[PDB]
Amino acid sequence: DLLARRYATIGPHSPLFYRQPLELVSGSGVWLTDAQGKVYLDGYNNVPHVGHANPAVADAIYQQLLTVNLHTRYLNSRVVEYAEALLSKFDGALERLFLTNSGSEANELALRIARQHTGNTGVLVSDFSYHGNTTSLAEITTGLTVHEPLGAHVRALRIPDVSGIAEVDVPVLLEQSLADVDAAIASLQAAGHGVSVFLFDPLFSTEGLLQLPSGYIEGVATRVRAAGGLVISDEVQSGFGRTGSGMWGYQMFNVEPELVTMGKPMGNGHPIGAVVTTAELLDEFGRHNMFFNTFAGNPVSSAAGLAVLRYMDQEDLMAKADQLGKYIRKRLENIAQRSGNVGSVRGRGLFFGIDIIESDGSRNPAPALTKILIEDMRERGVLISRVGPHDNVLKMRPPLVFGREHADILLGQLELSLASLPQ
């Protein structure tokens, strides 16, 4: 009676995947086993960045739990070691760290640092995005339903997507998108909000995995900084080497953010987030606020984060993701060329997707067919999902220990699944 018992305690609205919620009882690496003993390839979960049940992570956490686990008002070496290891993954002026317990807490603090620093309130976000679940983040949310109306201090941008657009038309797309940014900024200024931040997921995953014209992000940053604002890269989806080509998603662009936020993978499942920032921004915020987060930077959270970084580094996972990503993209392009139910190939590294469309010549988004594919792939023993404003972009985002053998299983099942659709 597990579903009933859940509904009587945490309630029926807390989301569950699939028509029939799956009960997953164990995992190992990329493999998950449900309560009936069926085994699935995990094509979806990024939180277990270094695999389900990774024993190096388990051991590091357990050993620290046998030692001591206190807040950061007493000195302790584990937090300092972890901060050093994490900050060694950043360049330029990104050289200080605030630890938190979630991605929402990180984005909440980043927006607060920015609001205080800039003396402005205005927020630029995409028109189909999600950055967390606090009050301030609800007021800026466009990609999921919330009761709060969109804040008067918010402008939502239509982030440009070159996918399937003729290469001759990109310059007009870029020029128009940037004029839209100018208009947003001028609007926020006229209203008295000014510009505090541009906040974005570098993969634009919730948006449908957009491929941007070169110069868009750089152009936004320039305009935002001319308005006295800051740039925040939300790395919850693109971070920790997920893209292959760089540790952080913002590296796909010619931009250095003042603020970088993170959560998901960082502790393999342990509740940890962070805000990485400049010396000037951390120092200022600390002079103005007696800021403290009780659980942040505790030794056990730090042990978990350290073990994740150590494991990624020892197993060369980021470089592996880059090579495997390229292979997967070539296969997906073959799939797209031949399937009338596939539009464009999207993403990078081990965050990959395809938009699912009607085969009747309309190229219309086909959410229903997308659902069919998600459910059929589950039947075939692979967990995937979807994103995007039309609910038609398959989203594949496995643990970063997913290798070539796993990719061939997933892609072969995807092909067969596509071949089973009608018309």
Cα distance between residue 216 and residue 171, in whole Å: 10
Does 234 engage in binding with ligand EXT (CB under 6 A)?
Answer: yes
Alpha helices in 128-201, H assignment, sequence order: 135-138, 170-190
- Of 19, 36, 37, 75, which one interacts with a copy of itself (CB under 8 A)? 75
x/- string (CB under 8 A) for a copy of itself, residues 266-305?
A: --xxxxx---------xx-xxxxxxxxxxx-xx-xx----
Cα distance between residue 333 and residue 339, in whole Å: 10
Per the CB < 8 A criterion, the answer to whether 156 and 125 are in contact is: yes
- Cβ neighbours of residue 55 closer than 8 Å, sequence gap 6 or more: none
- Cβ neighbours of residue 420 closer than 8 Å, sequence gap 6 or more: 376
Q: Which two tokens stand for residue 277?
A: 């920032």
Residue 10: which of a copy of itself, ligand EXT, Na ion, none does it interact with, CB under 5 to 8 A by kind? a copy of itself
x/- string (CB under 6 A) for ligand EXT, residues 291-310?
A: -xxxx---------------
- Of 254, 289, 294, 364, which one interacts with Na ion (CB under 5 A)? 254
Relative orientation angle of helices 317-338 and 299-314, to the nearest 10 degrees:
70
First to last CA, the chain: 41
CB under 6 A: which stretch of 84-92, 131-139, 176-184, 239-247 binds ligand EXT?
131-139
* Closer residue to a copy of itself (CB): 157 or 296: 296
* Among candidate residues 135, 139, 143, the one with its CA nearest the CA of residue 210: 143
Does 102 engage in binding with ligand EXT (CB under 6 A)?
Answer: yes
Per the CB < 8 A criterion, the answer to whether 223 and 180 are in contact is: no
- Of 23, 95, 218, 379, which one interacts with Na ion (CB under 5 A)? 218
Does 58 engage in binding with a copy of itself (CB under 8 A)?
Answer: yes
x/- string (CB under 5 A) for Na ion, residues 317-336?
A: -------------------x
Q: How far is the CB of 241 from a copy of itself (least distance, A)?
A: 19
Q: Is 142 annotated as a binding residue?
A: no
Residue 253: which of a copy of itself, ligand EXT, Na ion, none does it interact with, CB under 5 to 8 A by kind? Na ion
Evaluated on CA atoms 42, 266, 295, 17, the torsion sign reads: negative
* Among candidate residues 237, 219, 252, 14, the one with its CA nearest the CA of residue 129: 237
CB under 6 A: which stretch of 209-217, 289-297, 299-307, 410-418 binds ligand EXT?
289-297
Q: How far is the CB of 13 from ligand EXT (least distance, A)?
A: 15
CB under 8 A: which stretch of 65-73, 152-160, 219-227, 322-330 binds a copy of itself?
65-73
Residue 52 is classified by DSSP as B
**3-state SS, residue 38:** coil
Does 253 engage in binding with Na ion (CB under 5 A)?
Answer: yes
Q: Angle 311-317-319 (CA atoms, 0-180°, nearest 5)?
A: 140
Q: Is 251 annotated as a binding residue?
A: no
Neighbours of 291 (CB within 10 A): 13
Cα distance between residue 376 and residue 205, in whole Å: 23
Residue 388 is classified by DSSP as S
Per the CB < 8 A criterion, the answer to whether 253 and 160 are in contact is: no
Q: How far is the CB of 169 from ligand EXT (least distance, A)?
A: 29
Chain centroid, CA 108 distance in Å: 16
Does 264 engage in binding with a copy of itself (CB under 8 A)?
Answer: yes
DSSP β-bridge partners for residue 52:
29
Q: Is 20 annotated as a binding residue?
A: no
Residue 336: which of ligand EXT, Na ion, a copy of itself, none does it interact with, CB under 5 to 8 A by kind? Na ion
Residue 218: which of ligand EXT, a copy of itself, Na ion, none does it interact with, CB under 5 to 8 A by kind? Na ion
Q: How far is the CB of 217 from Na ion (least distance, A)?
A: 4
- Of 79, 106, 110, 342, which one interacts with Na ion (CB under 5 A)? 342
CB under 8 A: which stretch of 108-116, 157-165, 226-234, 252-260 binds a copy of itself?
108-116
Q: Which two tokens stand for residue 339?
A: 């399937």
Q: Is 196 annotated as a binding residue?
A: no
x/- string (CB under 8 A) for a copy of itself, residues 109-138?
A: x-xx--xx----------------xxxx-x
* Closer residue to a copy of itself (CB): 253 or 311: 311
Number of residues assigned to the chain: 423
Q: Residues within the annotated binding site?
A: 103-104, 237, 294
